[PDB]
Design a protein around this ligand. Structure first.
Ligand SMILES: [Mg+2]
Ligand SMILES: [Mg+2]
Ligand SMILES: [Mg+2]
Ligand SMILES: [Mg+2]
Ligand SMILES: [Mg+2]
Ligand SMILES: [Mg+2]
Ligand SMILES: [Mg+2]
Ligand SMILES: [Mg+2]
Ligand SMILES: [Mg+2]
Ligand SMILES: [Mg+2]
Ligand SMILES: [Mg+2]
Ligand SMILES: [Mg+2]
Ligand SMILES: [Mg+2]
Ligand SMILES: [Mg+2]
Ligand SMILES: [Mg+2]
Ligand SMILES: [Mg+2]
Ligand SMILES: [Mg+2]
Ligand SMILES: [Mg+2]
Ligand SMILES: [Mg+2]
Ligand SMILES: [Mg+2]
Ligand SMILES: [Mg+2]
Ligand SMILES: [Mg+2]
Ligand SMILES: [Mg+2]
Ligand SMILES: [Mg+2]
Ligand SMILES: [Mg+2]
Ligand SMILES: [Mg+2]
Ligand SMILES: [Mg+2]
Ligand SMILES: [Mg+2]
Ligand SMILES: [Mg+2]
Ligand SMILES: [Mg+2]
Ligand SMILES: [Mg+2]
Ligand SMILES: [Mg+2]
Ligand SMILES: [Mg+2]
Ligand SMILES: [Mg+2]
Ligand SMILES: [Mg+2]
Ligand SMILES: [Mg+2]
Ligand SMILES: [Mg+2]
Ligand SMILES: [Mg+2]
Ligand SMILES: [Mg+2]
Ligand SMILES: [Mg+2]
Ligand SMILES: [Mg+2]
Ligand SMILES: [Mg+2]
Ligand SMILES: [Mg+2]
Ligand SMILES: [Mg+2]
Ligand SMILES: [Mg+2]
Ligand SMILES: [Mg+2]
Ligand SMILES: [Mg+2]
Ligand SMILES: [Mg+2]
Ligand SMILES: [Mg+2]
Ligand SMILES: [Mg+2]
Ligand SMILES: [Mg+2]
Ligand SMILES: [Mg+2]
Ligand SMILES: [Mg+2]
Ligand SMILES: [Mg+2]
Ligand SMILES: [Mg+2]
Ligand SMILES: [Mg+2]
Ligand SMILES: [Mg+2]
Ligand SMILES: [Mg+2]
Ligand SMILES: [Mg+2]
Ligand SMILES: [Mg+2]
Ligand SMILES: [Mg+2]
Ligand SMILES: [Mg+2]
Ligand SMILES: [Mg+2]
Ligand SMILES: [Mg+2]
Ligand SMILES: [Mg+2]
Ligand SMILES: [Mg+2]
Ligand SMILES: [Mg+2]
Ligand SMILES: [Mg+2]
Ligand SMILES: [Mg+2]
Ligand SMILES: [Mg+2]
Ligand SMILES: [Mg+2]
Ligand SMILES: [Mg+2]
Ligand SMILES: [Mg+2]
Ligand SMILES: [Mg+2]
Lengths: 147, 210
RNA sequence: CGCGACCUCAGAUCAGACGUGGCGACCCGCUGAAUUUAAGCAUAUUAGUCAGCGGAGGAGAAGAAACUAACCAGGAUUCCCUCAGUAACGGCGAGUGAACAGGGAAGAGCCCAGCGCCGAAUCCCCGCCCCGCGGCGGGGCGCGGGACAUGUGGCGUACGGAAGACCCGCUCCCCGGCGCCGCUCGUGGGGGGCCCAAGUCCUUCUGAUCGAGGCCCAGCCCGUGGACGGUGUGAGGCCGGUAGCGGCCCCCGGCGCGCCGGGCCCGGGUCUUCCCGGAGUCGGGUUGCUUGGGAAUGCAGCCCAAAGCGGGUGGUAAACUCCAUCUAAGGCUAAAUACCGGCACGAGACCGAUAGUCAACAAGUACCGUAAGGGAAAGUUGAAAAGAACUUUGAAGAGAGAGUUCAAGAGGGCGUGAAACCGUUAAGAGGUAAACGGGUGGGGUCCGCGCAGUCCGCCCGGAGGAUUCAACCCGGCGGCGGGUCCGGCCGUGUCGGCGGCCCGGCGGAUCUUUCCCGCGCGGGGGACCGUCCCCCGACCGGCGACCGGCCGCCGCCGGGCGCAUUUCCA
RNA sequence: ACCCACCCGACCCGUCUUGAAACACGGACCAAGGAGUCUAACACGUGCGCGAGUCGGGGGCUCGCACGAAAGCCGCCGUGGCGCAAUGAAGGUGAAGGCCGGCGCGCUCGCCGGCCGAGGUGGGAUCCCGAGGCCUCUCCAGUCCGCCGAGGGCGCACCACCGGCCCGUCUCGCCCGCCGCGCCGGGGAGGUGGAGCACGAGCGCACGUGUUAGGACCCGAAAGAUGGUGAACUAUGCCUGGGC
RNA sequence: CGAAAGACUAAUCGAACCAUCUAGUAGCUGGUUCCCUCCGAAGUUUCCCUCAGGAUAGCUGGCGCUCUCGCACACGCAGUUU
RNA sequence: CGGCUCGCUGGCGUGAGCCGGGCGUGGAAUGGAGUGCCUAGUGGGCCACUUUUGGUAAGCAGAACUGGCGCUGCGGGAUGA
RNA sequence: GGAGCGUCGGGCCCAUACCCGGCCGUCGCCGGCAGUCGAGAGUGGACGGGAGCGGCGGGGGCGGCGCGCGCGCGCGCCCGCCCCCGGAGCCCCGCGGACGCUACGCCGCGACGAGUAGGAGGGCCGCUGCGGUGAGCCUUGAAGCCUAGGGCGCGGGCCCGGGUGGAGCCGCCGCAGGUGCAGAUCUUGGUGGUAGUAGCAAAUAUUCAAACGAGAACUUUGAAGGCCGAAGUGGAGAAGGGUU
RNA sequence: AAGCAUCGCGAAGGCCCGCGGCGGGUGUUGACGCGAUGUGAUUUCUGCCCAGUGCUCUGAAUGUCAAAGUGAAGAAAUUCA
RNA sequence: GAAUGGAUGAACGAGAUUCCCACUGUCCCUACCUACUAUCCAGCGAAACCACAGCCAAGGGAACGGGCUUGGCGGAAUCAG
RNA sequence: CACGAUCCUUCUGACCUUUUGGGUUUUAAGCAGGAGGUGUCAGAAAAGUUACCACAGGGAUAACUGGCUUGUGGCGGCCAAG
RNA sequence: UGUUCACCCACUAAUAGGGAACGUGAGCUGGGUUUAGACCGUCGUGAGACAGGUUAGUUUUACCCUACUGAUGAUGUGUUGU
């Protein structure tokens, strides 16, 4: 909507709201990110600190599919499974405990955040954080790797 | 100029983009056209599956997709051989054949075989003339269907086996996953070095004798 | 010094063929700037982009791995989404910048050289006969010519192949013709042709109506047709059209059957014995370009220049060492994809004659420039030319009359006819240029009055006329509202039926393969849980979610009520 | 509102400018045209949908599209994006703590049972309790309704502060683990780096404003490049004629 | 091309003309289209091949939010003073 | 006031940190405060009192302080930032 | 004998400042009103016994918390009542509630109102087109144009009347934009003042008659006077023109 | 401009064109010639300066001096000579 | 200041000077005459320029005004200059 | 007061990481700490000339007039030793 | 002498000094400055430079307004004349 835009209210006023001493000239800074070193410095170095410089190690033909370890916290491990598994258990009386396959539901690494509920389990995962194992064991559960 | 806080950003409008902008006012037409041609391919290949040819189960590559399963390009030669199909005939009964597929694992091999076994079963091979010879299926399964299969033939469903609620043996409990990994990772790292130090030690023991 | 083979090479208006230029939107192959950015500028960038040259086709190019990967691995090219503004490059500045994997559209695969076997089993061309002949083809027959061993044809090509013995099973595929049958998706393929509903009905405006009012149910008729346009304004029904698995006629394709003429004796597994691959190419150096490709992604020139359990690749140079993975240096291939040029269609929240294409028109026109090249302006009388007969003045242009027209206050550059500017008429003014703000006054112009404007409206009092009722009951109709929730429908929360649960379905990483079916898995049952429905009773929010009576009140109609009531009128 | 009169007031606008009636520039007059756009990308604000999700593309299924090149639908519904995790150059690692009881010497260290479960301080809108009144036409009794409420509480959001947790790094230490006893693996306490955690707030669409990249508000060079056309003038050479 | 003057090269010459790259670039001139209402500046900071320009703070506006009590029952804050 | 914590400091003690209770207007005058986003123009200036440097001075140049003009009309100063 | 200078009076003059009043707008009010009592508000109301002229016998405070329009009262007759707005009649009414209430409405108090650059708000300001919608308007006259006619609006602008014209156009709610011009030595077209002006002055030259003819300074014929003066103002060609 | 004075060249040359060729101009030429400069008829003169900057000559006697080739070590890339 | 030529030098020169003779309106010191113009008329008939305009003194003012202040003052329509 | 960013180089530091299908070694790349410098010192790599000149702008700025000022120049006083 | 300035001759009453955009270029001239040709000297490696000398080198428009000069007229006085 042109209808609602500023240019409709500027009509009549001369400079078109760009001031009249300094004007709406073409490119007075320099085009684009020019001057990050000289003359636009300050901006780049209180709002993009670290822009300039090299840092770290090259890696020539990166392929992202090698570093694909999506994670899940314990906090919500029981979200992977249908509520009635977590119900039938805290019941049953067998001390059966279910399995939660994490590599099924889309993660490869059970990280350690969250309180995990007093309810035995097994947890299949490609990886585990130390604390995530210790929380499962503390519950009364088996960390089970799977390649 | 920049002005107080916000992504430095490099946008790629430096070459003559306007000369080469591609507009999608086609698209609807093109959805229509393709579809027509699609419908006409079906009506051409009257009872053959519109989908096209039967394609095999295949795992995707790379630790990422790994767990998912797709359709393949075509069934490999081991898989035909075992299912008992001549490779030049497979093309003629609606069976996709690529030949470049190695077959490493015995599991996939038998899966695909089980497809082809399944397929040949539920296939309604018409005869050459209306005058029936061997192979070509009965007038029963012909009248009751000269019927297509809409949708990919024997669709490739990526499936799970449910692991029942166990007990967790004390021996199962005991495991120390976090460590075992860290060790394992290390033992890979170091495998080469150690065996150089061992090779040096065995040389020192032999050198002691002479 | 002859004649003959071949070889290399000439000449022919020798016989028959073919290439030549154009167009160039899209495609392929070279060639390749500089403006620009970097706030200067040189590398970088602009850009492998404009301009230049070459060559194409309905597409092109690409393409059946010397591929990706490193996984439990995928499997030609193209295209879209994503990857990713990422890895990477960069005066690591400005800026640049992919790829595999994943999901999709489409999907199609193959043939040589070689190595070998087959009496060259092959090919082109001439001449006679039969067929066929507007995309020169089929069959036959010629001691008719040539090409071919410096290698044609079948078999076969890396997914392995060839040849042998015996296991098995059995024998349809192609083309040149000649017919004949079903007209074969926009719901009868393509092209062409010609046809198909219903008012000029009644009044009435109008110059003319397609208008306005009406027409057995918004009126008549049709409507699978009320898109559009034309017709003297605004039209479903005047005309063309429009609609329709509507009609007929042609012509052309494409597929079904029959006959003839040819071709064509065309498998698979199992064991044995053989066979196996493209050289000044790879690879290395190098220089220059090029790339995101970084101790060299690609492409080049030059020098060097291979191998065969080799060769390439494995995104950091080098040696050793395992793995993986392809098979390079020959070739063909539809399909999704492209398309500001062409032929032909449709459409638009676009433009509406200074716009929109330079171009609505005799426009790439006139004109300009030696030439390359540049390059306009310019739409509109009226329904109908009915375009002004005739008289008159004038040498005529011009007028004056007359006439046509609804109108010429539409008169051939003529619809509307603005402003700037001018001529005239009327009014007013005028020595400090004019114009202007504020404040009055004078005059003009029209507008509103009043031939009293005393402006209305209630209620009231009085004097005159006026018909019928209010009030009251009686009959009918309708409405509201109400509780006794009275009786019944209606639905919220709860409890009871475990009753729908199988006569209630879906879902579930809840179970069971005691089940069934199909091949440990798929489908269907069978349990379980969650969720949605029947039966009655009870309590409660008795909820605008409604009926029936009954009550109360209101209104309407019709009866009566005749005049201290009742309205009207002055 | 048309003209005229007079009193008072009154310089010509546009613009740059410290300063314009200027002896600053533009402007004789009138008509029509004429300048902040569109795409991309971010940012913040705002509106809506959904919410630890969200999402639509791209594709597909539904029709000859009158309106449709729409609309609807999809185990594609989620390949995938963005979000739900951070930090480190990287190898990699990756957000909890408390209490209680017991066992190891409670050794502010190591191992086993039970309970609570995102810590605390100050301030904090709000909620809750409420002594007490304040009357009622009488003397007391006395349930109901308020009004206020002295005082005390639980305290959102946000802020200040303290502890606490994860990644990097340092310092100093002492223990534990096993198929591989190793230049192996795992811990502790104390500082310090982090775009962290500390009961989630995002995603999709739309509007606005800003900032860039693009012709980029409109108009403006002197140049620079590519490819062509010209010696009819003129500059010189040559050929063939004329003239003095 | 020049018996030389930077002369001449089709009214053009210290680098002809035509078309394209091209809407070249411009810290510089010029313009930049209706009304009311409300708030309402700066010409100083530091850095800049910066000095007719940018950056950065300052000043402006807009949007809000958290709280406050004239609802007999207030805490903080100031171009002051004591 | 009372008590706890400390690995710091220390003849004992310091010092800091924690809990738990007890005490209300603490000079005048004025005023509702706090807080976070996005943010335009601007970044040529000039004038005056007083202070003040350069200069013989200047409608000169350059500083301080406040206030003006610039953005601002109005009465006065005949006229005038 | 100030209309001068210095020092001093009374009086009077008028700014857009000050004071009072009106009016428009803005801001502020935890502002008011979805229908109720009530003006330093400092209560209202069951309900039970015991009673009645009793009451709550508290400050020169000068008073707010308590008193003189009633508490019990007049009627029915020491006992009963102290009654209902579908009717108390009303200054307050808790039974039902605007003439008012487009709650984006309406109402009331205050304070305030310079503005470039710049920002923000509201426009029932305006232009063109699309979805909706006015049983909208229009040949018994649309658009446009003109107007010493009548009005509205602070304004942007708008409504009416008359004329002209001759076919289409508008209000409202939404959507969209190639949306508003005095300027740009702006683009195109048109028009003035200049102005009946500058000008129609290089190379000696014209005159008389006649004809034709509507018309003769200029045409043609005759006469006279003149010039070019054979390196020509004579006759012929080249190039160039292209029918002259 | 005549005159004067230098410089280069004997042709697989000097000078110069050309994108390129067993290309082209000078050249149908050959030192009394082609090409490159300076001065400027005649008369009369034309001094000194080889330090500078140019141009040129000579070259295993000889400092530096690339790519290649040769050797060196190394597993090689390599480094050294 | 010596072929970056030095010194000369007849003849030549729309070349740069100086002086003399003659000569003259160059001048004292201006006048007269001729032709074409201008002028006036008939006919025809442009352009540049132009915010508005158009009398001065002083004042102040972006420090030299037609406009402003305060004074002077102001009389149609025009012609040749 | 005595001194200097990114990028590159160089050295120094750990039984450090990475050198990409795995392993060993060289090489290289990282991480961290010093050094080589930018004096225009918040840090381009940089000579002239134009009278043959060109463009954008500038009265933010020179060459006249005019203002202010009057040192300087010019004129004139006062004092009075001579 | 291009000059302003200066100097000198001669006469004279005296041969005073100044202003008006340093009066006065649509009044002239253009001799000088101040383009382009060229010469010299000095400087410069050079292109070139020189308030160092030399020579050659387009001086546009009035018809507007005003001002000025002259020239018709204008209002009044009844009309006209003296
Ligand atoms: Mg403004
Ligand atoms: Mg401006
Ligand atoms: Mg602005
Ligand atoms: Mg600015
Ligand atoms: Mg498919
Ligand atoms: Mg640049
Ligand atoms: Mg620039
Ligand atoms: Mg440049
Ligand atoms: Mg490039
Ligand atoms: Mg091209
Ligand atoms: Mg061709
Ligand atoms: Mg092809
Ligand atoms: Mg190939
Ligand atoms: Mg992304
Ligand atoms: Mg590039
Ligand atoms: Mg062969
Ligand atoms: Mg019909
Ligand atoms: Mg019609
Ligand atoms: Mg019609
Ligand atoms: Mg490059
Ligand atoms: Mg490597
Ligand atoms: Mg090909
Ligand atoms: Mg046109
Ligand atoms: Mg036109
Ligand atoms: Mg046009
Ligand atoms: Mg028009
Ligand atoms: Mg017509
Ligand atoms: Mg017209
Ligand atoms: Mg008419
Ligand atoms: Mg007409
Ligand atoms: Mg007309
Ligand atoms: Mg008129
Ligand atoms: Mg008159
Ligand atoms: Mg100035
Ligand atoms: Mg002035
Ligand atoms: Mg200017
Ligand atoms: Mg002008
Ligand atoms: Mg306009
Ligand atoms: Mg948002
Ligand atoms: Mg921003
Ligand atoms: Mg532009
Ligand atoms: Mg922009
Ligand atoms: Mg331009
Ligand atoms: Mg350049
Ligand atoms: Mg600048
Ligand atoms: Mg405000
Ligand atoms: Mg204000
Ligand atoms: Mg400026
Ligand atoms: Mg500025
Ligand atoms: Mg200003
Ligand atoms: Mg205001
Ligand atoms: Mg018409
Ligand atoms: Mg438009
Ligand atoms: Mg205009
Ligand atoms: Mg005249
Ligand atoms: Mg003569
Ligand atoms: Mg002749
Ligand atoms: Mg002749
Ligand atoms: Mg010489
Ligand atoms: Mg020498
Ligand atoms: Mg000399
Ligand atoms: Mg000398
Ligand atoms: Mg003037
Ligand atoms: Mg390897
Ligand atoms: Mg010069
Ligand atoms: Mg010169
Ligand atoms: Mg020259
Ligand atoms: Mg100045
Ligand atoms: Mg001066
Ligand atoms: Mg002068
Ligand atoms: Mg003059
Ligand atoms: Mg002159
Ligand atoms: Mg001169
Ligand atoms: Mg000169």
């Amino acid at each position: 909507p042109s209808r609602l835009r500023k240019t409709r209210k500027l009509r009549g006023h001369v400079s078109h709201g760009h001031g009249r001493i300094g004007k709406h000239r073409k490119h007075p800074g320099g085009r684009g990110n020019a001057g990050g070193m000289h003359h636009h410095r300050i901006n780049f170095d209180k709002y993009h600190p670290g822009y300039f410089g090299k840092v770290g190690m090259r890696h020539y033909h990166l392929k992202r599919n090698q570093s694909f370890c999506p994670t899940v916290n314990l906090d919500k491990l029981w979200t992977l499974v249908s509520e009635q598994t977590r119900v039938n258990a805290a019941k049953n009386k067998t001390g059966a405990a279910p399995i939660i396959d994490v590599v099924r539901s889309g993660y490869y690494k059970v990280l350690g955040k969250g309180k995990l509920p007093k309810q035995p389990v097994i947890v299949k995962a490609k990886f585990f954080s130390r604390r995530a194992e210790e929380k499962i064991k503390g519950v009364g559960g088996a960390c089970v790797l799977v390649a | 100029a920049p002005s107080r806080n916000g992504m430095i950003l490099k946008p790629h409008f430096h070459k003559d983009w306007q000369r080469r902008v591609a507009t999608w006012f086609n698209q609807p037409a093109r959805k229509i056209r393709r579809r027509k041609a699609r419908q006409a391919r079906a009506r051409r290949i009257a009872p053959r599956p519109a989908s096209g040819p039967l394609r095999p189960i295949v795992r995707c590559p790379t630790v990422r997709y790994h767990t998912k399963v797709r359709a393949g390009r075509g069934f490999s030669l081991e898989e035909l051989r075992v299912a008992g199909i001549h490779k030049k005939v497979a093309r003629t009964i609606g069976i996709s054949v690529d030949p470049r597929r190695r077959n490493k694992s015995t599991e996939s091999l038998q899966a695909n075989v089980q497809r082809l076994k399944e397929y040949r079963s539920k296939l309604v091979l018409f005869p050459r003339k209306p005058s029936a010879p061997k192979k070509g299926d009965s007038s029963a399964e012909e009248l009751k269907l000269a019927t297509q299969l809409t949708g990919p033939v024997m669709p490739i469903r990526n499936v799970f086996k449910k692991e029942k609620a166990r007990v967790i043996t004390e021996e199962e409990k005991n495991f120390k996953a976090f460590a075992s990994l860290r060790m394992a990772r290390a033992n890979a790292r170091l495998f080469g070095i150690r065996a150089k130090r061992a090779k040096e030690a065995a040389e020192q023991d032999v050198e002691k004798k002479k």
